[PDB]
Amino acid sequence: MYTFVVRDENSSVYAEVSRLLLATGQWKRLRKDNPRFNLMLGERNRLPFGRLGHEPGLVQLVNYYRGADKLCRKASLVKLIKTSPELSCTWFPESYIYPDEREVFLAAYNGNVWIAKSISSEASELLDFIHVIQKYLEKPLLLEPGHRKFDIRSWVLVDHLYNIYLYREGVLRTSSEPYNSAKTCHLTNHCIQKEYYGRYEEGNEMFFEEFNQYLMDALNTTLENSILLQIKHIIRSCLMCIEPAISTKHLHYQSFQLFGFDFMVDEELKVWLIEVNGAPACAQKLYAELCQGIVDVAISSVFPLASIFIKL
Amino acid sequence: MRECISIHVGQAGVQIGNACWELYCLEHGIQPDGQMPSDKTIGGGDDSFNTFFSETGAGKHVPRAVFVDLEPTVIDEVRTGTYRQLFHPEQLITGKEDAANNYARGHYTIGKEIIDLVLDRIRKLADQCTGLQGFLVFHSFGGGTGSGFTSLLMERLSVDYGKKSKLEFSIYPAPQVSTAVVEPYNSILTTHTTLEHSDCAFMVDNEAIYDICRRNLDIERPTYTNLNRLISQIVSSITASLRFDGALNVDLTEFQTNLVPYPRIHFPLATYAPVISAEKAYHEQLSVAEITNACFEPANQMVKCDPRHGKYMACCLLYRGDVVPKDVNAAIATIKTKRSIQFVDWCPTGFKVGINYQPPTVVPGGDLAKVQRAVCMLSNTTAIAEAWARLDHKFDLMYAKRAFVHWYVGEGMEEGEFSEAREDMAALEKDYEEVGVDS
Amino acid sequence: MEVIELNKCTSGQSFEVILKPPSDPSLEEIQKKL
Amino acid sequence: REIVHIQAGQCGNQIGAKFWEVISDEHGIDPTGSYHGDSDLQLERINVYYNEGNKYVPRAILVDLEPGTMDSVRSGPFGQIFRPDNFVFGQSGAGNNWAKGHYTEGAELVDSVLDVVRKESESCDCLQGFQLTHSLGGGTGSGMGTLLISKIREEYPDRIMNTFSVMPSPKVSDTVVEPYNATLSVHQLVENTDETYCIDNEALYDICFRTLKLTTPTYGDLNHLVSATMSGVTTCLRFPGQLNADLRKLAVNMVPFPRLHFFMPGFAPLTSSQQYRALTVPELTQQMFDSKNMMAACDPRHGRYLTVAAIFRGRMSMKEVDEQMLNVQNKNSSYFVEWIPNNVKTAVCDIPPRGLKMSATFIGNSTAIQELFKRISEQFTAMFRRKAFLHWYTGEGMDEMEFTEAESNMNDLVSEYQQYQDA
Ligand SMILES: COc1cc([C@@H]2c3cc4c(cc3[C@H](Sc3nnc[nH]3)[C@@H]3COC(=O)[C@H]23)OCO4)cc(OC)c1OC
Ligand SMILES: Nc1nc2c(ncn2[C@@H]2O[C@H](COP(=O)(O)OP(=O)(O)OP(=O)(O)O)[C@@H](O)[C@H]2O)c(=O)[nH]1
Ligand SMILES: Nc1ncnc2c1ncn2[C@@H]1O[C@H](COP(=O)(O)OP(=O)(O)CP(=O)(O)O)[C@@H](O)[C@H]1O
Numbered sequence A: 001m002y003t004f005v006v007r008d009e010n011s012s013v014y015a016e017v018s019r020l021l022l023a024t025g026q027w028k029r030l031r032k033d034n035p036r037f038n039l040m041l042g043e044r045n046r047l048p049f050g051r052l053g054h055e056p057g058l059v060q061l062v063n064y065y066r067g068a069d070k071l072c073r074k075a076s077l078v079k080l081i082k083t084s085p086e087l088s089c090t091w092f093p094e095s096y097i098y099p100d101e102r103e104v105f106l107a108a109y110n111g112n113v114w115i116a117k118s119i120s121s122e123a124s125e126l127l128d129f130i131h132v133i134q135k136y137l138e139k140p141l142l143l144e145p146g147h148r149k150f151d152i153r154s155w156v157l158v159d160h161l162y163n164i165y166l167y168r169e170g171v172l173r174t175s176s177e178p179y180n181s182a183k184t185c186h187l188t189n190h191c192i193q194k195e196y197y198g199r200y201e202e203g204n205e206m207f208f209e210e211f212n213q214y215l216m217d218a219l220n221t222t223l224e225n226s227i228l229l230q231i232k233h234i235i236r237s238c239l240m241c242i243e244p245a246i247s248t249k250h251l252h253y254q255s256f257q258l259f260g261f262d263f264m265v266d267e268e269l270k271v272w273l274i275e276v277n278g279a280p281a282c283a284q285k286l287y288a289e290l291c292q293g294i295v296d297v298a299i300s301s302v303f304p305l306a307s308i309f310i311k312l
Numbered sequence B: 001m002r003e004c005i006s007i008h009v010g011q012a013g014v015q016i017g018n019a020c021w022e023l024y025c026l027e028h029g030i031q032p033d034g035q036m037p038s039d040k041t042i043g044g045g046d047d048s049f050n051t052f053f054s055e056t057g058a059g060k061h062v063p064r065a066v067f068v069d070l071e072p073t074v075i076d077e078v079r080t081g082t083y084r085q086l087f088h089p090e091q092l093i094t095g096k097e098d099a100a101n102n103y104a105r106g107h108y109t110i111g112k113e114i115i116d117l118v119l120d121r122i123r124k125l126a127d128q129c130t131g132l133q134g135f136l137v138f139h140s141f142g143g144g145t146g147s148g149f150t151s152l153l154m155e156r157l158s159v160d161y162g163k164k165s166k167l168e169f170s171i172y173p174a175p176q177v178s179t180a181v182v183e184p185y186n187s188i189l190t191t192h193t194t195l196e197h198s199d200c201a202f203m204v205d206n207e208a209i210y211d212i213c214r215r216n217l218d219i220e221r222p223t224y225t226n227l228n229r230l231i232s233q234i235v236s237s238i239t240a241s242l243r244f245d246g247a248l249n250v251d252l253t254e255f256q257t258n259l260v261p262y263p264r265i266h267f268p269l270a271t272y273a274p275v276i277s278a279e280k281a282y283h284e285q286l287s288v289a290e291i292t293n294a295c296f297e298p299a300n301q302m303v304k305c306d307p308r309h310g311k312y313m314a315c316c317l318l319y320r321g322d323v324v325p326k327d328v329n330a331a332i333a334t335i336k337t338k339r340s341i342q343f344v345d346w347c348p349t350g351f352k353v354g355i356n357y358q359p360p361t362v363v364p365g366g367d368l369a370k371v372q373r374a375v376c377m378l379s380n381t382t383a384i385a386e387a388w389a390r391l392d393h394k395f396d397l398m399y400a401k402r403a404f405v406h407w408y409v410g411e412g413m414e415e416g417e418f419s420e421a422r423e424d425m426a427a428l429e430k431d432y433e434e435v436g437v438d439s
Numbered sequence C: 001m002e003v004i005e006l007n008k009c010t011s012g013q014s015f016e017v018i019l020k021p022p023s024d025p026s027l028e029e030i031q032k033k034l
Numbered sequence D: 001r002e003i004v005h006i007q008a009g010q011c012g013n014q015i016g017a018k019f020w021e022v023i024s025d026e027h028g029i030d031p032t033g034s035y036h037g038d039s040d041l042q043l044e045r046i047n048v049y050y051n052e053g054n055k056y057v058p059r060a061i062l063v064d065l066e067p068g069t070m071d072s073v074r075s076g077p078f079g080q081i082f083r084p085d086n087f088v089f090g091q092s093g094a095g096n097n098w099a100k101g102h103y104t105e106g107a108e109l110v111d112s113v114l115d116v117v118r119k120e121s122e123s124c125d126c127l128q129g130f131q132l133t134h135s136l137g138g139g140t141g142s143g144m145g146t147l148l149i150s151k152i153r154e155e156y157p158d159r160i161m162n163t164f165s166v167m168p169s170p171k172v173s174d175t176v177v178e179p180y181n182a183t184l185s186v187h188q189l190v191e192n193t194d195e196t197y198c199i200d201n202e203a204l205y206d207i208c209f210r211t212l213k214l215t216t217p218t219y220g221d222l223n224h225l226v227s228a229t230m231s232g233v234t235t236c237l238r239f240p241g242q243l244n245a246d247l248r249k250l251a252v253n254m255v256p257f258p259r260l261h262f263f264m265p266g267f268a269p270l271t272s273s274q275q276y277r278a279l280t281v282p283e284l285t286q287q288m289f290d291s292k293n294m295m296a297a298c299d300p301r302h303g304r305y306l307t308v309a310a311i312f313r314g315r316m317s318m319k320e321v322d323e324q325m326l327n328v329q330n331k332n333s334s335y336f337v338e339w340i341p342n343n344v345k346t347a348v349c350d351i352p353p354r355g356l357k358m359s360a361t362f363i364g365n366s367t368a369i370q371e372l373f374k375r376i377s378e379q380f381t382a383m384f385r386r387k388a389f390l391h392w393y394t395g396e397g398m399d400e401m402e403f404t405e406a407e408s409n410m411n412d413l414v415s416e417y418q419q420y421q422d423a
């Protein structure tokens, strides 16, 4: 009989994961602050990693990698991609500061559109709205009919052995507004699309089977060849780069973590990393399958009872 | 030559002190009757080993050591042990009834009664010293004596020996090795009271020693003897530079100079390798690169924590055995490109290295096998603050309900001293965060 | 990677290796508390 | 660190004499006081309970207000072993009346007892404190015993007071006034003891009838359980090892708040012996923590464990003990409080009791003990609301006010235990 605790009630994904653990009769949920647990579904911020792995007779596992934030916040990721000998690249947009690299940003500024986050053609306009300034991809790949923009979300699971698992099912989050290069047909955020949709696909969400068919009909190529090879390359580059820093291989406690990678695709079918998310949600259609895969490969591998993933 | 006086307080300090002096005698070829055939200056000398041993006209080498416990049963196993002849009665000090796992009883109630005696017996050792450097103090964080009396003694040592250095070897509590339920209280109380009187403190977490004993010696349920013989190996690695010829950490002041830039952040992490079972017939001898690499494995540390998620202020590598500088620098260069090793920005990224060619001594019949080389790394990393955060958290849980507090107030301690102590530890935790993390 | 302050004796040696440079209560007050 | 043992009244001297028979055997002391054992753990801490022609004498004082039961001890198997001057008795008896034990009959005899206590305490190199055996339902153990405890505290205020207190039950009752005597006594214990083992005659009867399938349990059967418990619960005080416990460390570690010092013991295997199949360590741990094995009729699942100390005796896997002990907490974490970390501790002793190759004993400070004080409070109140049987007590000088205050203090105690069951 294994025990676990739940310290993130706002977690869509691990709400489903715990309900599956219970429904096996071999997992018991304790109260949040009970230390005598096997499994912690931790909080998003200030999770107390220093108290893990000190309970006698308990193998302890947590669903976050301490140190993963360096991939998963946009300033850290630009720094990481810029100072790591193993990436610092080609698939990451030229990115650049606090309200440093201000002299250097203006030096390349000498298509000249950029975006700030943490969109303009004039540097002066945004430096005083201020954070990272990232080269805006002026020539995206546009879905038709619709002349529309999109981003690809990939779910990636890293288990306690630091095996990297790419979920078979991605999702394209699409703009329902034709793309005008002269801020809604520019932001594919789903909450921004269903507030400012449902036109062509249910939920501005196109899944891989349809998107592959689209590439076969429209471009005479496949999702695997034209895009996923680059996706798998990028996922490996980022996670293998940070591996010595965050691996729990010889640690007194064990980590796994689910990541959401966000990619852009341009006109020449080149894939670009936009960002990495450390606490991703899922597509409703996919919750059941992915949360079951999390239990199978991340949790029961450590705590056995009585493939939907590509192995990267 | 400048002398060092060792002081062992409470059960853990005494029983560990027993193991160390046993080891020191083996390392220096001193027989249990105190005779030392290697020493050709009878009844005197100022060799390096005289820092820890004085000499009688009869040729006996006597530890500059005092053993103190508020109960007689542990020290009585020194009186009647294998080295009875080594110590003389004045150095073994026992009271009548112990501190009952209670810092306040060890510090206020019984400590008052016995401090002047202990200080008098230490004075008899200091008077034999031509140039006393200071003290090495062995004690538990958790015991009533080890916590309560040690802190009173350290305060009085700063009074009576103001210019002298004081080093600690502190046993940090772990439920795997029988602990009182109030050990968090005792630990915080004594750290607060001792913080400004100690120049450098080596914490040893019983959880770490216990696990090394299970994993590397494959002892299923290690005894105090198993634990203490491993601890003594690490202690001996740390104090070798005081007792042998060399140029690194040759007096107590250098420990502070080399390991402690900031006086409050004075708890270096010790990491030791290799630890090899003696019933393991044929084992490959680990290389300089391997044992040095093992110094960055949390499984070999004296306190479990993650140095990758902290910053280094200072790092010393102490090798024993067949080791030359060439191999050290090769191993370091390799390790710098694979490990995550961040120093604070105001400190040089580097290593002070000391090598003693004599390989470690082990106790005949013990569970540790002889090795041809070993290393102890001493690093001041902010990651050790995880140990404080853990302890501080347990203290909070109990104190929020004032559980057990009445035992402490009943001995004359004011409840306010809990809050005083805990607030000091809160500052301590934030000092570490300032030094080693960025927002 | 610089090696400085190398000292040798018959018992061993010591040195420093640099990889990168950088960017009290009284007796009476005690007696009162007791 | 010597313990002075006092046994008072009929129950006190009966379970007292059994305790000395049992541990005398365990330490290899024969009825004539000469040591004829085969191991040296036996003698290493023998002086905790025995004084020393190389004969050993229990540091035991035998007290009663009538000479009957102590004539029975002097004729019993080990009767020769007690120091004859340590028998202190009167002729009148206490009539199952707390007031007589505490205020009239007992007051006459208590100074004689303290002279014997004082003499034993003087021959002590370092006195740990006192251990008293008694019931709360009678007159001498209950009334005079708590009077002794008060007089002892006043003369030795810095020593520990420990009691084994037998709580009355209607299932094993001598008189209807037992709830009155027990309620008056609990009040004394809340104030003047540091540790009280609650030995509940209801739990002992249930265990004899259900588990041991003895359909007509005698006091002899009940006392077999109490004897086994007293031995196990004192093991770490009498034997050397890893952890050498004493009365003060017991109290510091088990009592988080001064009034909550009433412990539920538990024992395994429960026996009436007759069986040779030794138990596996898993089974010891399972039974010991089962309600059907605890000597106080309280459901631990109705409350929470504040602190627990367990001792395993015999030869067995230290590694398996730790595994099973850690298993029980990690499987029922709900019944241990969050705000006392690591509140379950385990010891081992190689020397098993008699007739058992391995055993386990459990000391628990559980909030479920409030059920025992509620039960007594209810029985007390049923009579006291009609002032029934009170003339037995007012005839000795007592006023009703004293009963009201005792009722109030015991209900407070129940409340305090409930306060921490909801913390
Ligand atoms: C009277 O017998 C026992 C007492 C204790 C008891 C005792 C009782 C406890 C407790 C702790 C502790 C501590 S344990 C310790 N080990 N090193 C320092 N302190 C201490 C030690 O001496 C003690 O007397 C304390 O937590 C909850 O209940 C424990 C026992 O077994 C675990 C014994 O048998 C059950
Ligand atoms: N490593 C090691 N730890 C010990 C040893 N003895 C006790 N401990 C640990 O020390 C702490 C208990 O304090 P002790 O030193 O035994 O107690 P004490 O200082 O004698 O104080 P009192 O007995 O309360 O007067 C616990 O955390 C034990 O686990 C030992 O020989 N070796
Ligand atoms: N260089 C860039 N070029 C083109 N489009 C970009 C872009 N950067 C961001 N976008 C668009 O913005 C949308 C979301 O932006 P971004 O991923 O940077 O913030 P976010 O809302 O996703 C924070 P998080 O998801 O981590 O909580 C993307 O879907 C994309 O359409």
Ligand SMILES: Nc1nc2c(ncn2[C@@H]2O[C@H](COP(=O)(O)OP(=O)(O)O)[C@@H](O)[C@H]2O)c(=O)[nH]1
Pocket (backbone or CB within 6 Å): D008, D009, D010, D011, D012, D014, D015, D094, D095, D096, D097, D135, D136, D137, D138, D139, D140, D141, D142, D166, D167, D168, D169, D172, D173, D174, D178, D201, D204, D219, D222, D223, D226
């Ligand atoms: N367990 C046990 N209980 C007893 C024994 N003798 C009496 N009792 C109980 O003790 C209470 C009566 O007290 P008793 O000791 O006989 O009176 P006293 O002599 O005045 O102290 C009742 O609750 C009885 O059930 C005994 O030998 N064993």
Ligand SMILES: [Ca+2]
Pocket (backbone or CB within 6 Å): B039, B040, B041, B042, B043, B044, B045, B046, B055
């Ligand atoms: Ca000499």
Ligand SMILES: [Mg+2]
Pocket (backbone or CB within 6 Å): A262, A277
């Ligand atoms: Mg996003």
Ligand SMILES: [Mg+2]
Pocket (backbone or CB within 6 Å): B010, B011, B069, B071, B098, B143, B145
């Ligand atoms: Mg002690």
Ligand SMILES: [Mg+2]
Pocket (backbone or CB within 6 Å): B001, B002, B003, B046, B129, B130, B131, B132
């Ligand atoms: Mg000198």
Ligand SMILES: [Mg+2]
Pocket (backbone or CB within 6 Å): D010, D011, D138, D174
């Ligand atoms: Mg009777």
Ligand code: NA
Pocket (backbone or CB within 6 Å): D092, D105, D108
């Ligand atoms: Na009379």
